[PDB]
């Protein structure tokens, strides 16, 4: 009911109005990115009436920032969407226009990626330091079929050399991978972003919106949806969806909801579509303050309860317990936003990242990782300020720790027992600030808000094929699953692109929209990209240097070079620095 | 002064208004596709004032004896620059839709494909129609041509890189006729063609990758562009023959200073500053065209018109401006020269065509789906019938058939004369003979039941003449400040000439470079670098054979296959090879 494409013909073409869409409706369970994106596609490409689009939201109608909102040029579906969303900052421009010009005048890249020993730059910062053994494990994982990686951990496919490389430092912190996480997803990430392998260590491929995601992405979409008459319904808690799973069809029949404290039922026909964002990484989040830890919690909220209630109606609707249960207590739980106008802290950051944090341009250019921190802590300062109404002499630093059950190096407690100022203290210690100044700087010169998120690592938990429902399950007539717990080929979860892709594929499949959906970018199949990957993974070495200490490889290269000597193949390899 | 890109990010992004463009002007020499495309990019992306854009057209503000259709207007999905342009051009046929939208929907409603590609023996279908019949020697020659650096193919002919097996294959029949390649043409250009369209190799034999506009190109492409340009105030100036352009070539600059013209018979001069851009469509394949009618041949000619004279005048001002003589001189007399448009409402002719192409030519949908090649015709003649009618003023009971012949100095099989000596009706007679029409009816059906207009084009094969690097000027020559060359005689990497995409690409690259527009230009599609496309090509070129079938008759290959298959026996590589039918 859909097909994949690439290139400008399908990118620029508009689909015909889908058949019978005038008699159809749509219900979106949640107000997250994927739901908003699906509503936008329903308006723009489905041409469905806005009065027939119902966004069900459970909520009624210091600074806290969120990390992991990096973008790249090849977010193919996301840019298809946001070229149609008007900017709220520039007249007669799209969100993509604003994003595109901004990252041209202020291109992102890091001048200091890893620090250690209380503020010193890692001496090999920039290099991957992968042994030939570690490189082979990388390629061996990529050559493994995804079907053979059910429930396989990252530690099952990599050994000591890899986990000691600089590559693993960059990789695990920029993507928030834990050693026990899905090797299947690790493999997807390896192939998905291969075209940016030369920009991995210095973050030169990253692109950021001007403000936080809510200001720069959500609010423009909401304004677009509101200007098209989309129904935003609040105080709606979806408890279950009655689905008929027969030998021939899957049909959602009823949405069982609590609407403002009253038990209600939404009757559905085959023409009423339901889009379920199954699972949530932010559900059950708790907050502390400068003097209070964010209270740890294991509670299952509405999103996880609903997926469980859908999963007991068919195994084709996924297995939520693989993602929300048995999360190791070492996993990342706590993040913190530290806000300050203190010049000593701001100057300390400038001395490390080499940029004025208050200038309004790129600062750290992405996370700085403290390699020898017991918490495995990283921090980033985006373009300041990240909030429109924040004072111009303030910065807000985002901090997160990959290990939650280890005592800190300065605050000798696990991060889950730490207040905002205590997290700030441990961070300032690793910045190199004097231990006689750190306590007062955190307590009285800064405000740090910690957040405890039980499911923040849930996207990456070890999974088997079938644990995630297909975007449109087999024989589903009016039910779709979207978001980063839905299943689609090749693309990587924990990205905003995945939310937009699944939203797009859901709308196109359910309405049978006659336009191609852009395939995940073809970089793993591009010889030019694979050539660059070989060059970068070996830390800028020729094919001669790569094979110099291997008999079988040096022999095979010799016969290869003799065949390609006069040819376009050699010119290509030379152009990509492999010869 | 430009960069290449791919993907939706740069496709959907708009460039900032270029600096100081409000103080700049533009002159475009010609009214062909490239000139209009460059004017459209100047409006849309350069944001140059339309009143400051001047299109200089030589002819005053089609032969009256009959309809004339042009060939070589096939399109494909990966005309990346052309679709970038025409998504911005409003359709003249459909409200609230671009030229792309109309094109996109039409070719989905009525997808092009051929049900009869090659005929012989006066209307019988070729038995092996569909297969390439390429031997291992021929396939290896194709690969070895592609593995040859373009820098090593200066003036190399197609006959220099291929031997008997290839020229005896069905592949060469399909290839030489669909693209109008002659044996003495540029092997460098054939190499570009092989890699440029590799993603469509499975559709080469049945034309299933071709896409066509609803009407002839003037109606479907030119008029929508003209309406777009005129709605923005672009000046269309006629009766303007450009004789020369004075260019100051210095150590650090090349600046056009003066356009020497003949405006309505009066010698005139357009003074240029560095802020006045000049776009030259150097050379022309249609220049000096002559026309016959049903009773008169199109008179042969060797005359150079204004286009080739202008390029020659520019070429002697700098060696970086190309060598026009490589394309407009020494054209073999066997080369394709004559095309003919045969129009009829005769049921007998139309029924005969339907019996060959399997479709009703008057239904309004695809008819032949591309050219039908008459393989055993002495003229090496092909003909096509697009969706009918191709003209908005044409009667609904009429069809217009496009006919062309690759060999111009060989006696026909029924009209025993070279095509250059044949009137319109005589070309029609030879064509009707090869359709299987009874010889007792051919004369009456061609002379009285049909109207055929022959055209003689001395330079119709000029794009493909053997060339060396430097024969074509760069789109923007080194240090050129206000001068650009566009069209299918300008130089840009990888892309293939004799395509409408090449005209739009050069126009885009000229405007973007001269104005320093800060947006990516889509690279030529990356199919020769795509492992999935290369796997499909191996399968298709070997006529749908496994790697095991391909290597069964070999020792140095069956051995390597065994060792290769053992190393990949559980891996993602084997899955990919099975997915693309190589295993």
Output the six-digit token pair for B137: 């020697």
CB distance B338 to B180 below 8 Å: no
Question: What token pair was written down for B475?
Answer: 């789109």
Write down how long chain A is: 579
SS3 at position B302: coil
- The answer to whether the CB atoms of A518 and B8 lie below 8 A apart is yes
Q: What is the resolution of this structure in A?
A: 2.1
Contacts of residue B389, defined as CB under 8 A and 6 or more positions apart, other chains included, come to B395, B396, B398, B399, B400
The answer to whether A65 touches A396, Cβ cutoff 8 Å, is yes
Q: Which residues pair with A251 in a beta bridge?
A: A244
Inter-residue contact A84 to A221 (CB < 8 Å): no
Strand partners, A399: A336, A379
Nearest neighbour of B518 by CB, restricted to A104, A145, A527: A104
Q: Are A27 and A1 in contact (CB under 8 A)?
A: no
Q: Does B79 contact chain A (CB < 8 Å)?
A: yes
The residue among A317, A493, A471 whose CA lies nearest residue A1 is A471
What 3-state DSSP class applies to B401? strand
CA-to-CA distance for A470 and A353, rounded, in angstroms?
A: 43
Phi, psi of A218 (to 5 degrees): -70, -50
Say if residues A372 and A425 touch (Cβ distance below 8 Å). Answer: no
Q: Which of A6, A7, A99 to mutate to test the interface with B (most CBs of B within 10 A)?
A: A7
Q: Is residue A421 within 8 Å of A446, Cβ to Cβ?
A: yes
Tokens of B313: 């005048």
Candidates A292, A295, A334, A332; CA nearest to A419 is A292
Instruction: Using alpha carbons, select from A105, A119, A456 the residue that is nearest to residue A294.
Output: A456
CA distance linking residue B511 with residue B279, whole number of Å? 9
Closest CA to A128 of A111, A118, A113: A113
- Burial bucket for residue A478 (CB in 10 Å: 0-12, 13-18, 19+): buried
The two three-digit tokens of residue A252, written as one number: 């959602």
- In whole angstroms, what is the distance from residue A407 CA to residue A416 CA? 10
Phi and psi at residue A355, in whole multiples of 5°? -140, 145
Phi (first) and psi of residue A275, to 5 degrees: -115, 115
**Cα–Cα distance list, B564 to A213, B548, B558, B569 (Å):** 49, 12, 10, 8
A270 token code pair: 């085959």
Measured between alpha carbons, how far is A156 from A182 in angstroms, rounded to an integer?
Answer: 10
Compute how many other C-beta atoms are within 10 angstroms of the C-beta atom of residue B197.
20
Alpha-carbon gap, residue A345 to A424, rounded angstroms: 11
d(CA B36, CA B224): 10
Q: How far is CA B315 from CA B229, B245, B326, B471, in A?
A: 31, 11, 12, 10
Strand partners, B563: none
**Cβ(A250)–Cβ(A11) below 8 Å:** no
Interface contact A97-B13, CB threshold 8 A: yes
B149 at A interface, C-beta within 8 A:
yes
DSSP type of residue A294:
P
Residue A49 exposure: Cα atoms within 13 Å on the Cβ side:
9
Phi-psi region of A565 (alpha: psi -120 to 50; beta: other; left: phi over 0): alpha
Q: Is A393 helix (H, G, I), strand (E, B) or coil?
A: coil
Q: Residue A520 has which token pair?
A: 């995940």
Candidates B221, B208, B157, B213; CA nearest to B185 is B157
Residues 6+ apart with CB under 8 A from B563: none
Please say whether the beta carbons of B53 and B39 come within 8 A. Answer: yes
The conformation of residue A182, written as its DSSP 8-state character, comes to: B
CB A206 within 8 A of CB A108: yes
Q: Under 8 Å CB-to-CB from B261, ≥6 apart: which residues?
A: B56, B240, B241, B242, B243, B267, B268, B269, B270
Q: Give the strand pairing for A4-5 and A517-518.
A: parallel
| Number of other CB atoms surrounding residue A568 within 10 Å | 18
A150 CB-near residues (< 8 Å, 6+ apart): A184, A463, A464, A465
Q: What domains are there in chain A, each with its CATH number?
A: 17-61+234-282+466-513 (3.50.50.60), 523-575 (no CATH)
Distance CA B32, CA B488 (A): 11
* Angstrom distances, CA of residue B563 to CA of A100, A188, B4, B545, B548: 49, 28, 40, 19, 13
Assigned token pair, B254: 């090349």
Both tokens of B342, joined, read: 């045969």
With beta carbons less than 8 A apart as the criterion, state whether B283 and B489 touch: yes
Count other C-beta atoms under 10 Å from residue A270's C-beta: 12
Length of chain B in residues, anyone?
Answer: 583
Chain A residues inside the 8 Å CB shell of B573: 143
Q: Omega before A338 cis (within 30°)?
A: no
Q: Which residues of A508-546 are buried (b: 16+ CB within 10 A; e: fewer)?
A: bbbbebbbbbbbbbbbbbbbebbbbbbbbbbbebbbeeb
Per the listing, tokens 């970038």 go with B84
C-beta of residue A564 within 8 angstroms of C-beta of residue A574: no
User: Do the strands B118-120 and B25-29 form a parallel or antiparallel pair, or are they unpaired?
Assistant: unpaired
Quote the minimal CA–CA distance from B42 to chain A in Å. 19
Binding site listing of B for FAD: 33-34, 57-58, 70, 73-74, 242, 284, 306, 500, 503
How far does the CA of residue B369 sit from the closest CA of chain A (Å)?
A: 21
Q: Which residues pair with A86 in a beta bridge?
A: A94
Q: b/e string for B373-391 if b means 16 or more Cβ within 10 A? A: bbbebbbbbbbbbbbbbbb
Check CB contact of B565 with chain A, cutoff 8 Å: no
Helix (H) or strand (E) holding A380: strand A377-380
Q: Hunting for tokens 């002919």 — which residue is that?
A: B157
Nearest C-alpha neighbor of B519 from the set A48, A271, A527, A73: A73
CA angle B284, B290, B291 (to 5 degrees): 130
Token output for A192: 């998905």
* CA pseudo-torsion sign B560, B562, B563, B567: positive
Judging contacts by C-beta atoms under 8 Å, the chain A residues touching residue B79 are: 9
Nearest Cα to A65, choosing from A422, A339, A345, A464? A339
Measured CA distances, A275 to A80, A502, B144 (Å): 20, 10, 53
Contact yes or no for B87 and A527 at CB 8 A: no
CA-wise closest residue to A88 among A200, A226, A192: A226
Q: Is B518 on the interface with A (CB under 8 A)?
A: yes
Which H or E run contains A135?
helix A132-142
Contact B387, B370 (CB under 8 A): no
Q: Looking at residue B221, what DSSP letter applies?
A: I
Which residues face B259 on adjacent strands?
A: B245, B270
A536 interfacial to chain B (CB closer than 8 Å): no
Q: Could you tell me if B94 lies within 8 Å of chain A, comparing CB atoms?
A: no
Q: Where are the alpha helices (DSSP H) in A245-335?
A: 302-311, 321-324
Using CB atoms within 10 A of its CB, is residue A307 exposed (0-12), middle (13-18) or buried (19+)?
A: buried
Looking at the DSSP bridge assignments, the partners of residue A53 are: A26
> In angstroms, how far is the first alpha carbon of chain B from the final one?
46
d(CA A54, CA A73): 31
Distance CA A368, CA A345 (A): 15
Q: Which DSSP letter does residue B77 get?
A: T
- Which chain B residues are closer than 8 Å to A514 by Cβ? 108
The sign of the torsion formed by the CA atoms of B342, B347, B349, B353 equals: positive
For residue A76, the chain B residues in CB contact (below 8 A) are 7-9
Asked if residues B80 and B501 have their Cβ atoms less than 8 Å apart, the reply is yes
Cβ neighbourhood burial of B576 (10 Å; 0-12, 13-18, 19+) = middle
Q: Are A507 and A45 in contact (CB under 8 A)?
A: yes
Dig out the tokens for A234 from the structure. 């609040």
**Parallel, antiparallel or unpaired: strands A446-452 and A334-340:** antiparallel
Q: How many helices (H) and strands (E) does chain A have?
A: 20, 18
Which residues of A define the annotated binding site for FAD?
33-34, 57-58, 66, 69-70, 238, 280, 302, 496, 499
Q: DSSP characters for B512-559?
A: HHHHT--SPEEPSP-GGGBHHHHHHHHHHHTTS--HHHHTTT-STTHH
Q: Distance from A12 to chain B by nearest Cα, in Å?
A: 6
Angle subtended by helix axes A132-142 and A183-192, to nearest 10: 100
Q: What is the distance between the alpha carbons of residues A194 and B542, in angstroms, rounded to a whole number? A: 32
HEC states along A4-45? EECCHHHHHCCCCCCCCHHHCEEEEECCCHHHHHHHHHHHHC
Nearest CB among A13, A96, A528 relative to B100 is that of: A13
For the record, the structure tokens of B200 come out as 């469509």
The coordinates were experimentally obtained by X-ray
């Amino acid at each position: 009911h859909m097909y994949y494409s690439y290139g400008n013909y399908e990118a620029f073409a508009r689909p015909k109005k889908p058949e019978n869409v005038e008699n159809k409706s749509a219900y979106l369970i949640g107000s997250g990115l994927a739901s908003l994106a699906a509503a936008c596609f329903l308006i723009r490409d489905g041409q469905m009436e806005g009065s027939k689009i119902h966004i069900l939201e459970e909520l009624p109608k210091g600074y806290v920032v969120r990390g992991g909102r990096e973008m790249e040029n090849h977010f193919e579906c996301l840019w298809d969407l946001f070229r149609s969303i008007p900017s709220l900052e520039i007249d007669n421009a799209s969100v993509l226009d604003e994003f595109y010009w901004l990252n041209k005048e202020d291109p992102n890249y890091s001048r200091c990626r890893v620090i250690e020993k209380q503020g010193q730059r890692l001496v090999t910062d920039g290099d991957f330091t992968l042994t030939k053994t570690a490189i082979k494990e990388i390629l061996d994982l990529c050559l493994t079929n995804e079907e053979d990686l059910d429930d396989v951990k990252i530690t099952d496919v990599f050994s000591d050399d890899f986990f000691n490389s600089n590559f693993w430092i960059y990789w695990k912190t920029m993507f928030a991978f834990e050693p026990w996480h899905s090797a299947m997803e690790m493999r997807r990430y390896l192939m998905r972003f291969l075209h940016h392998i030369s920009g991995l260590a210095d973050f030169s491929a990253l692109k950021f919106t001007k403000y936080n995601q809510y200001e720069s992405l959500v609010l423009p979409m909401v304004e677009y949806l509101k200007s098209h008459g989309v129904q935003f319904e609040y105080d709606v808690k979806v408890e279950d969806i009655k689905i008929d799973v027969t030998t021939s069809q899957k049909i959602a029949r009823e949405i069982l909801i609590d609407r403002n404290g009253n038990a209600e039922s939404i009757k559905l026909t085959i023409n009423d579509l339901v889009f379920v964002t199954n699972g949530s990484i932010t559900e059950s989040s708790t907050y502390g303050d400068n003097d209070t830890p964010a209270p740890p919690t294991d509670e299952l909220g509405g999103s996880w309860t609903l997926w469980k209630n859908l999963a007991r109606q068919s195994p084709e609707f996924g297995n939520p317990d693989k993602f929300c249960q048995n999360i190791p207590k070492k996993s990342w739980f706590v993040s913190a936003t530290s806000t300050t106008n203190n010049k000593e802290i701001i100057d300390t950051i400038e001395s490390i990242c080499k940029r004025d944090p208050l200038a309004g341009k790129t600062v750290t250019g992405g996370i700085i990782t403290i390699n020898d921190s017991a918490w495995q802590m990283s921090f980033t300062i985006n373009r300041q300020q990240q909030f429109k109404d924040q004072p111009e002499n303030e910065i807000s630093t985002w901090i997160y720790a990959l290990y939650s059950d280890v005592n800190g190096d300065y605050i000798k407690k696990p991060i889950t027992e730490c207040s905002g100022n205590e997290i700030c203290q441990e961070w300032l210690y690793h910045l190199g600030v004097s231990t006689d100044k750190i306590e007062d700087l955190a307590k009285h010169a800064s405000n740090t808000i910690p957040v405890y998120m039980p499911y923040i690592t849930s996207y990456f938990m070890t999974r088997a094929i079938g644990d995630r429902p297909l975007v449109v399950p087999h024989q589903s007539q009016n039910l779709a699953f979207i978001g980063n717990f839905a299943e689609t080929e090749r693309d990587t979860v924990f990205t905003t692109e995945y939310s937009v892709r699944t939203a797009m594929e859901a709308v196109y499949q359910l309405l049978n929209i006659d336009r191609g959906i852009p395939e995940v970018i073809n970089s793993p199949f591009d010889l030019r990209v694979l050539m660059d990957a070989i060059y970068e993974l070996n830390d800028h070495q020729d094919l001669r240097e790569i094979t110099k200490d291997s008999k079988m490889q040096k022999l095979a290269l010799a016969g290869f070079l003799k065949k390609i000597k006069g040819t376009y193949i050699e010119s290509l390899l030379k152009e990509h620095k492999l010869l």
